[PDB]
Scaffold this active site. Structure first.
Site, PDB file in Angstrom:
ATOM      1  N   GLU A 113      -1.408  -4.895  -0.509  1.00  8.56           N
ATOM      2  CA  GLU A 113      -1.746  -5.900   0.508  1.00  8.56           C
ATOM      3  C   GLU A 113      -0.641  -6.967   0.421  1.00  8.56           C
ATOM      4  OE1 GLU A 113      -5.883  -6.528  -0.322  1.00  8.56           O
ATOM      5  OE2 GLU A 113      -6.407  -4.916   1.013  1.00  8.56           O
TER       6      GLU A 113
HETATM    7  C1  HEC Z   1      -4.115  -6.243   4.991  1.00  6.19           C
HETATM    8  C2  HEC Z   1      -2.936  -5.763   4.284  1.00  6.19           C
HETATM    9  C3  HEC Z   1      -4.911  -7.311   4.372  1.00  6.19           C
HETATM   10  C4  HEC Z   1      -4.519  -8.616   4.087  1.00  6.19           C
HETATM   11  C5  HEC Z   1      -3.133  -9.214   4.156  1.00  6.19           C
HETATM   12  C6  HEC Z   1      -5.691  -9.349   3.762  1.00  6.19           C
HETATM   13  N1  HEC Z   1      -6.805  -8.539   3.914  1.00  6.19           N
HETATM   14 FE1  HEC Z   1      -8.728  -9.104   3.815  1.00  6.19          FE
HETATM   15  N2  HEC Z   1      -9.317  -7.229   3.792  1.00  6.19           N
HETATM   16  C7  HEC Z   1      -8.503  -6.144   3.939  1.00  6.19           C
HETATM   17  C8  HEC Z   1      -9.232  -4.900   3.666  1.00  6.19           C
HETATM   18  C9  HEC Z   1      -8.678  -3.466   3.785  1.00  6.19           C
HETATM   19  C10 HEC Z   1     -10.438  -5.283   3.245  1.00  6.19           C
HETATM   20  C11 HEC Z   1     -11.570  -4.418   2.739  1.00  6.19           C
HETATM   21  C12 HEC Z   1     -11.249  -4.015   1.250  1.00  6.19           C
HETATM   22  C13 HEC Z   1     -12.425  -3.475   0.404  1.00  6.19           C
HETATM   23  O1  HEC Z   1     -12.151  -3.046  -0.734  1.00  6.19           O
HETATM   24  O2  HEC Z   1     -13.566  -3.540   0.894  1.00  6.19           O
HETATM   25  C14 HEC Z   1     -10.491  -6.743   3.322  1.00  6.19           C
HETATM   26  C15 HEC Z   1     -11.636  -7.502   3.103  1.00  6.19           C
HETATM   27  C16 HEC Z   1     -11.732  -8.843   3.392  1.00  6.19           C
HETATM   28  C17 HEC Z   1     -12.905  -9.670   3.450  1.00  6.19           C
HETATM   29  C18 HEC Z   1     -14.305  -9.151   3.207  1.00  6.19           C
HETATM   30  C19 HEC Z   1     -15.174  -9.194   4.471  1.00  6.19           C
HETATM   31  C20 HEC Z   1     -16.506  -8.478   4.262  1.00  6.19           C
HETATM   32  O3  HEC Z   1     -16.783  -7.855   3.181  1.00  6.19           O
HETATM   33  O4  HEC Z   1     -17.310  -8.408   5.292  1.00  6.19           O
HETATM   34  C21 HEC Z   1     -12.560 -10.933   3.723  1.00  6.19           C
HETATM   35  C22 HEC Z   1     -13.460 -12.155   3.859  1.00  6.19           C
HETATM   36  C23 HEC Z   1     -11.117 -10.938   3.785  1.00  6.19           C
HETATM   37  N3  HEC Z   1     -10.631  -9.684   3.629  1.00  6.19           N
HETATM   38  C24 HEC Z   1     -10.361 -12.099   3.909  1.00  6.19           C
HETATM   39  C25 HEC Z   1      -8.949 -12.128   3.731  1.00  6.19           C
HETATM   40  C26 HEC Z   1      -8.192 -13.338   3.528  1.00  6.19           C
HETATM   41  C27 HEC Z   1      -8.771 -14.717   3.509  1.00  6.19           C
HETATM   42  C28 HEC Z   1      -6.888 -12.940   3.373  1.00  6.19           C
HETATM   43  C29 HEC Z   1      -5.672 -13.773   3.093  1.00  6.19           C
HETATM   44  C30 HEC Z   1      -5.711 -14.487   1.797  1.00  6.19           C
HETATM   45  C31 HEC Z   1      -6.842 -11.476   3.484  1.00  6.19           C
HETATM   46  N4  HEC Z   1      -8.110 -11.042   3.699  1.00  6.19           N
HETATM   47  C32 HEC Z   1      -5.711 -10.734   3.514  1.00  6.19           C
HETATM   48  C33 HEC Z   1      -7.161  -6.208   4.369  1.00  6.19           C
HETATM   49  C34 HEC Z   1      -6.325  -7.270   4.203  1.00  6.19           C
END
Ligand code: HEC
Ligand code: HEC
Ligand code: HEC
Ligand code: HEC
Ligand SMILES: [Ca+2]
Ligand SMILES: [Ca+2]
Lengths: 323, 323
Positions: A113
């Site tokens: 990521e």
């Molecule tokens: C793509 C390369 C990503 C980046 C950059 C960030 N996120 Fe992400 N997010 C990504 C995935 C593939 C997943 C699911 C992973 C898993 O193991 O389940 C997530 C999950 C979240 C969530 C959870 C939401 C929920 O469970 O309903 C949140 C709140 C979230 N991501 C926020 C978030 C933030 C604040 C980021 C920058 C610091 C960030 N993500 C980057 C993919 C990617």
């Protein structure tokens, strides 16, 4: 009546962002969190921000099967929406993070990521002259406020504002019977009567607990990749194999593709697979169409976010790392 | 007086966006262009938008040495700012595109940038139900308004709004002597007296013509990579070898790294290299510091852009291509 039944199982999204215990949302801390959510310098490459994979213009997701991060590396899971994520019981598809502040530390550090580390992130923010002042305004009682923990807290209070009130279904729940069509109301009755609300209830239409993906039938090794055992990897408890948190269905019509594998693009297919896998039923095409018309009423008002103007590097800012 | 000399060579950025001949800026066409600038579905991967490499929060650039696009492929050149680019005589570092609409067709198609093709882009926009209505509002006299040419025109009238009025130097040019510091005014006198304004003049502080990078001295094969002969590749004219368009110096303090190669990170180093390479002088460290203080007065008001809410895919939308 189906309206009264729905009012006993679901609740509308409040207009006001929820309060995070031990993370007060001052104007400065929320503004800081919005800057950080859009700042690609949170990544090693200086190219990936949270909005890359959770695009506020595309329903808080990236509309890919699974996300692509540093080095063009594809991950194992579909990116869930940040919209309304503050109302889920825990974060990630396996619930392994307790809340949004804990969750935000994950993408920053994951090698597929953002591929950053906490020490490099703090050094980078300290080297951007406009950032330490904003951390002082947002975390004024700390001698050293530019910390990884504070990055995570700022982003949490920003994400708590990324809620989507006023979907047509919420207007129905508030007593406006005409806010959804007769066909949507028939989809709602089918959703209730087939049992879908057991796992997709409450203020968030889901996000409420942990269930096997495949209570009655294995969805097969494409839709449920065998190596991804869900919460079993978190707990090592055999009863957690292939157990995942139910998703919130708010905004599901605009967050395709579906499931944690991202392999199902059409919402009508996801509905039929839920009937088979979870409930052991074959939903007819006409019933699936009415349920999809109902799920389309769960799309709320999309947040209207001004893209931040981010403070410039100094000559001491670390240079991007792209390998 | 140095103010009067400056008033004869430079002009402030107007508050109103300039008019594009044969591309009128209706509210609908500018709104469409803002949506398209932020929509990563302009790329094959559905992950890269124009804001990826021209980030409106980071001075309209990506703060990398050279840009990284589809497949994590690094390109040969540094991404110039879109801010004020509408006032340059031609676009790209070699001036090969005549205006912003012509320029926008380049990144869409380049294999190391968005890696798309026009036919796939049109099919994709036609498959997103919310896009054809907006093309009809923006291009109402056309039977088939969703075209590559119209994408380019919409993005042009949006980019013509990405101007940065009100830099302190512009307030000085309008007659406020106190809008810049005495040290900045001494930098301005040094800029004028050493000859820098020959190539960095007018409303845009540059963007005015084509000059060798290395009039007096070769900057060497790192800062001027030998294979990148600049406008020679465009014209095949030997007098164009290593000739590049002068950049606008507006917002230069926030658009590091510098030159078309992106190899010089510090603005003071770029100033010294310009004195050597262009003028055959060794600018002292004290003089370079005053010139950098002057260049810092060219940072204007950054645009305040609401991130668009983009229309969702249909089930017929083409699926991302990431290989
Ligand atoms: C793509 C390369 C990503 C980046 C950059 C960030 N996120 Fe992400 N997010 C990504 C995935 C593939 C997943 C699911 C992973 C898993 O193991 O389940 C997530 C999950 C979240 C969530 C959870 C939401 C929920 O469970 O309903 C949140 C709140 C979230 N991501 C926020 C978030 C933030 C604040 C980021 C920058 C610091 C960030 N993500 C980057 C993919 C990617
Ligand atoms: C609990 C036993 C469930 C019942 C009954 C139903 N759903 Fe469900 N749903 C559940 C889980 C645990 C998950 C995630 C599975 C995974 O590993 O990916 C889901 C997912 C969906 C989705 C996809 C949403 C998204 O990807 O964001 C949809 C559209 C969905 N569920 C709809 C739905 C319907 C219509 C149901 C009744 C027929 C139904 N679900 C039942 C858990 C449970
Ligand atoms: C990164 C992978 C890019 C994407 C995506 C887009 N642009 Fe870009 N842009 C990029 C580079 C490396 C360059 C310079 C290339 C060269 O040969 O000189 C450019 C150039 C521009 C310009 C010219 C500005 C000027 O000459 O002063 C403009 C106006 C511009 N780019 C706009 C633009 C738009 C509208 C895009 C989306 C359709 C887009 N770029 C994507 C890097 C990348
Ligand atoms: C014309 C003969 C020039 C004179 C005299 C000076 N500059 Fe220049 N400058 C010129 C060109 C053609 C270019 C681009 C060269 C390339 O291939 O990259 C530049 C670039 C700069 C920059 C970098 C800006 C950016 O990368 O966005 C700066 C900071 C700059 N020039 C400053 C500058 C100063 C201070 C000068 C007098 C000492 C000077 N330039 C003279 C063309 C010409
Ligand atoms: Ca999804
Ligand atoms: Ca630059």
């Amino acid at each position: 009546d189906v309206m009264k039944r729905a009012q006993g199982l679901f609740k509308p999204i409040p207009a006001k962002p929820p309060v995070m215990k031990d993370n007060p949302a001052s104007p400065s801390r929320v503004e800081l969190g919005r800057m950080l959510f859009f700042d690609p310098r949170l990544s090693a490459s200086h190219l990936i921000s949270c909005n890359t994979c959770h695009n506020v213009g595309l329903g808080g997701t990236d509309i890919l099967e699974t996300s692509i991060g540093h080095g063009w590396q594809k991950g194992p899971r579909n990116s869930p929406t940040v919209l309304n994520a503050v109302y889920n019981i825990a974060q990630f598809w396996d619930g392994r993070a307790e809340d949004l502040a804990a969750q935000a530390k994950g993408p920053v550090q994951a090698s597929v990521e953002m591929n950053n580390k906490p020490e490099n992130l703090v050094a980078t923010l300290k080297s951007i002259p406009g950032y330490p002042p904003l951390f002082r305004k947002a975390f004024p009682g700390q001698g050293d406020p530019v910390t990884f923990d504070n990055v995570a807290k700022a982003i949490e209070v920003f994400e708590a504002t990324l809620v989507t009130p006023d979907a047509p279904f919420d207007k129905y729940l508030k007593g406006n019977r005409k806010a959804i069509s007769s066909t949507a109301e028939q989809g709602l009755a089918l959703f209730l009567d087939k049992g879908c609300a057991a796992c997709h209830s409450g203020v968030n239409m889901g996000g409420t607990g942990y269930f096997p993906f495949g209570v009655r039938e294995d969805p097969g090794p494409v839709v449920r990749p065998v190596d991804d055992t869900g919460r079993y990897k978190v707990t090592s408890t055999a009863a957690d194999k292939y157990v995942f948190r139910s998703p919130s269905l708010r905004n599901v019509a605009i967050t395709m593709p579906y499931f944690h594998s991202g392999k199902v693009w059409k919402l009508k297919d996801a509905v039929k697979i839920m009937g088979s896998a979870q409930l052991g039923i074959s939903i007819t095409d006409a019933d699936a169409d009415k349920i999809v018309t109902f799920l389309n009423t769960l799309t709320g008002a999309q947040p209207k976010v001004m893209h931040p103007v981010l403070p410039p590097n100094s000559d001491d800012t670390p240079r991007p790392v792209s390998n």
